Symmetry: D2
Subunit: 113 residues, 4 copies
């Protein structure tokens, strides 16, 4: 199945935070309506914080991409809702062979405020 694709409410601010757990440099892109709106880049094996940003969801069509020097990683994802209100969308990825799926991570959360 496609992974890293999420439908958010339209015209809503969301946070996105990215991490590396990898020797290779991760490129984590956040697409809103098929257009890259944020890019996080880096490496490190101890949950390196690559950045955190707030974006508008546009029509609601979000897609997360993870790659290493142009090669797409294998993604895994899901979305969880707590208290019928607090949403998280998580993405892990695997750039290699050890299948730890932590190499490049994105965590989205909404609503804000």
């Amino acid at each position: 199945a496609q992974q890293g694709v999420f439908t958010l409410p339209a015209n809503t601010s969301f946070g996105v935070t990215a991490f590396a757990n990898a020797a290779n440099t991760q490129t984590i892109q956040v697409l809103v309506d098929n257009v890259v709106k944020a890019t996080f880049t880096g490496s490190g094996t101890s949950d390196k914080l690559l950045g955190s940003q707030v974006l508008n969801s546009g029509s609601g069509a979000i897609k997360i991409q993870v790659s290493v020097n142009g090669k797409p990683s294998d993604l895994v994802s899901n979305q969880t809702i707590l208290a019928n209100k607090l949403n998280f969308a998580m993405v892990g990825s695997e750039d290699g062979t050890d299948n730890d799926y932590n190499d490049g991570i994105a965590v989205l959360n909404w609503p804000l405020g």
Copy 2:
């Protein structure tokens, strides 16, 4: 039910990242074996990043506390596992009456490496 309590594998590094979406100052504490090992503090209504740290899980007994000037918030939490390997533990909290449950957030992830 108790919320914000998680059993991790013992002696394992994990990341914890904290956010505010609140006018009031949040105090988010990460306890390992009943001892506070990290504290994140701040306010802001746009997914303010309060910090991110890597901790050892000790025996595995983690507890997240959220309070505002000493008053415990109402917590909500769960844990998700992706690809049978990548773990997230999420905590939201409500400090007031609007029930957005985003006031003080913690996201834990493991394994690292």
Copy 3:
């Protein structure tokens, strides 16, 4: 936080399946727009299947109640979305003191078809 409350898409069929893991008789009610539309009753400690039904979501306001002889149980719940399409809403409950939270369970899933 309130638990067992879920917002579904309006006018959508969903499945709901109920289980017991309890010595006491569980009463598991599925409310749509504040009106009970299904009730599952029984006991048994080996994941007793109490029933499975398909309901219309009405406006989308679903609430699950669990009680034992009129006494409300303590609920825990969340919602997960897989492949940006397949939804599950889960409810556990505790009727006693052992905090296994499995006494009366409901699992909702949608969309059907």
Copy 4:
């Protein structure tokens, strides 16, 4: 990523319940330590309940397979833990082109009792 693979605690009873939302006949197999221990078969587009069984987890290595007349479906899965105690493992699958991922579903839950 591989999907439908879960690590359970060893020597633990778990419930597994299977559904169809499909015109084609689904074959849903539950493997414990690489050996099929339950098989659910059927079709129907309204959350047809194919069965529910309790199994021992063996070493803990569970795998869910879904196929239609021998052809493996595309699986999606995850695991959620509520109240640090109640576990669900969910599997959806797609046998065709509409990407509803509901064609053959398995829901696992533990602990029982």
